[PDB]
Amino acid sequence: SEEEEKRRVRRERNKLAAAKCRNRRRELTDRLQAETDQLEEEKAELESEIAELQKEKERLEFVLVAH
Amino acid sequence: QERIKAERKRLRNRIAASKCRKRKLERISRLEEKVKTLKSQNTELASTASLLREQVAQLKQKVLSHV
DNA sequence: CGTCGGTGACTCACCGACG
DNA sequence: CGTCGGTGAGTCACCGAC
Ligand SMILES: [Cl-]
Ligand SMILES: [Cl-]
Ligand code: NA
């Protein structure tokens, strides 16, 4: 048939668009998950940097009041 | 008669597909929200650390101005 | 002002879990 | 052994873009 071919290729083009939709959503989820993991490592390292600095600051303040 | 046992399975799968699609979108929203707050939180921590780095330095200088 | 692709939702195929 | 639910994938109906 000839209408059966217009319907067949339409089903093919749409099958690919569905796969593109699903793949884009998966790549988006991967991207976000990779980003949160990285931002959580940065936050942890900053919280650790801040903790050492607060310690160093208080040691120096007490060294300074000892004349 | 046997068409009812098949309507009931399509319903059960209809419910499972819905629950499945929903969880996917919920995960994306959580991550997008988490990225947003982690970017904000890290900018606040990053400046906290810069300020501490300067306070420690000024303190190291004040210790040497007293031998 | 007519096709195009994108997308929500139903459905089926397939798989591992498991009573 | 056989049914279950989760999930990938094909399909339909519909819509906005252009
Ligand atoms: Cl199911
Ligand atoms: Cl088309
Ligand atoms: Na639904």
Give a short synopsis of this structure.
The complex is a heterodimer of chains A (67) and B (67). By secondary structure, chain A is mainly α.
What descriptive keywords fit this protein?
heterodimer, A: 67 residues, mainly alpha, Single alpha-helices involved in coiled-coils or other helix-helix interfaces, 94% helix, rod-shaped, B: 67 residues, binds chloride ion, binds sodium ion, DNA-binding, Transcription factor JunD (chain B), Protein FosB (chain A)
CA gyration radius of chain A, whole angstroms: 29 Å
Number of helices of chain B: 1
Chemical compounds bound to the protein: chloride ion, sodium ion
CATH class of chain A: Mainly Alpha
What is the CATH T-level topology of chain A? Single alpha-helices involved in coiled-coils or other helix-helix interfaces
Number of E strands of chain B: 0
Outline of chain B: rod-shaped
Number of domains of chain B: 1
Specify the helix fraction band of chain B: over 70%
General shape of chain A: rod-shaped
* Whole-number count of domains of chain A: 1
Largest sheet of chain B: none
Cα end-to-end separation of chain B: 98 Å
Q: Which percent band covers the strand fraction of chain A?
A: under 5%
Q: Which strand-content bin applies to the residues of chain B?
A: under 5%
H-E order of chain B = H
Domain bZIP (chain A): 4-67
Subcellular location (chain A): Nucleus
Region (Basic motif) (chain A): 6-31
Protein name (chain A): Protein FosB
Textual characterization of the structure:
Chain A: This is Protein FosB. The complex is a heterodimer of chains A (67) and B (67). Chain A has 67 residues and is mostly helical. Helix content of chain A is 94%, strand content 0%. Chain A contains one helix and no strands. With 67 residues, chain B is mostly helical. Chain B has one domain: Single alpha-helices involved in coiled-coils or other helix-helix interfaces, CATH 1.20.5.170. Chain B is rod-shaped and about 100 Å long. Chain B starts with a helix and ends with a helix. The chains are: A mainly alpha (67), B mainly alpha (67). Chains A and B meet through helix 1 of A and helix 1 of B. One chloride ion binds next to helix 1 of chain A. The structure holds a DNA duplex (19 and 18 nucleotides).
